[PDB]
Each structure stands twice: as C-alpha cells, then as structure tokens.
Amino acid sequence: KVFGRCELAAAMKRHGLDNYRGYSLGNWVCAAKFESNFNTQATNRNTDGSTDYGILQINSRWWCNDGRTPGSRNLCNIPCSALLSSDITASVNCAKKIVSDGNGMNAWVAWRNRCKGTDVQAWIRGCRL
Numbered sequence: 001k002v003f004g005r006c007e008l009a010a011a012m013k014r015h016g017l018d019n020y021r022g023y024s025l026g027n028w029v030c031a032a033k034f035e036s037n038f039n040t041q042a043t044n045r046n047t048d049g050s051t052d053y054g055i056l057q058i059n060s061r062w063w064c065n066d067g068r069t070p071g072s073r074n075l076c077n078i079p080c081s082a083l084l085s086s087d088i089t090a091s092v093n094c095a096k097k098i099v100s101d102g103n104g105m106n107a108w109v110a111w112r113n114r115c116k117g118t119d120v121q122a123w124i125r126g127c128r129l
C-alpha cells in the first residue's frame with residue numbers, strides 16, 4: 001500500500017508514535033517519506049547483504065528475519081515480510097524498539113540527512129489529526 005501523507009500521519013498517531021521518545025509525529029512522517037516514499041512494500045538491499053523492509057526501511061541484520069542475512073539478530077522477533085503489510089502495526093512496534101535503542105531516530109539515515117533539524121511539523125500540516 002502507498003499511503004497518503006495525512007493518512008499515514010493519522011495511522012502513526014493512532015499507533016502511539018506522536019512524541020514517542022520525544023519525536024513529534026512530523027519526524028516519523030518525514031522519515032517514512034524519504035525511507036520508502038510511503039510505500040509499505042519497499043525493499044532495498046545493502047552491500048553487507050542485509051535488506052531494508054517496509055515503510056520505515058527496517059534492517060534485516062538487526063531487527064527482522066528474512067532467512068538470508070547470515071549472522072543476523074531478530075530483535076523485533078518477526079519475519080521481515082511482516083513489515084511489508086498494508087497494516088503498519090508490525091513496522092510501528094518494531095520502530096518503537098529501534099528508536100529506544102540509544103541512537104534515537106539517527107538509526108534512520110534518511111531521517112538524519114533529510115529530516116533532522118528541518119521544520120518537520122510541515123509534514124503534518126493540513127491533516128485532520
């Protein structure tokens with residue numbers, strides 16, 4: 001599923017991401033925009049053999065099992081394919097674990113490079129939340 005901007009903002013707010021660990025909703029929408037272009041089915045392979053999955057491009061070396069990333073942890077205890085569902089629940093639950101892991105949202109390279117320090121509130125403007 002390819003979400004709309006406000007549609008995803010509303011879904012993320014419902015799943016508890018607004019101000020989760022201090023990160024306002026616009027941060028999460030910004031990160032999803034640049035990680036996946038709001039596409040739950042996005043995948044990207046990395047040089048180390050791991051693959052990033054779903055709306056928040058969660059990585060298979062640490063967070064999910066895709067059966068082909070040798071020596072990987074499955075810290076969210078889910079198959080990576082669960083992260084491609086039109087229901088973002090699994091991605092949000094796993095993202096909450098990632099952002100609590102110490103480095104905050106810096107774990108998402110696109111958030112670091114394209115969202116951090118910008119006016120992220122712009123990502124939820126006009127949305128009925």
Ligand SMILES: CC(=O)N[C@@H]1[C@@H](O)[C@H](O[C@@H]2O[C@H](CO)[C@@H](O[C@@H]3O[C@H](CO)[C@@H](O)[C@H](O)[C@H]3NC(C)=O)[C@H](O)[C@H]2NC(C)=O)[C@@H](CO)O[C@H]1O
Nearest residue numbers: 052056057058059060061062063098101102103107108109
């Ligand atoms: C969205 C996504 O999947 N992003 C991936 C990043 O999570 C990942 O960065 C590395 O993640 C691990 C796991 O969070 C980091 O290790 C943690 O480091 C902190 C302190 O630095 C420590 O408190 C945690 O215990 C430790 N986790 C452990 C030991 O399990 C690690 O620091 C992150 N970055 C680096 C450079 O190692 C990157 C890199 O694989 O991939 C993203 O896709």
Ligand SMILES: [Cl-]
Nearest residue numbers: 018024025026
């Ligand atoms: Cl907000």
Ligand SMILES: [Cl-]
Nearest residue numbers: 021103104105
């Ligand atoms: Cl933080």
Ligand code: NA
Nearest residue numbers: 060064072073
């Ligand atoms: Na894994």
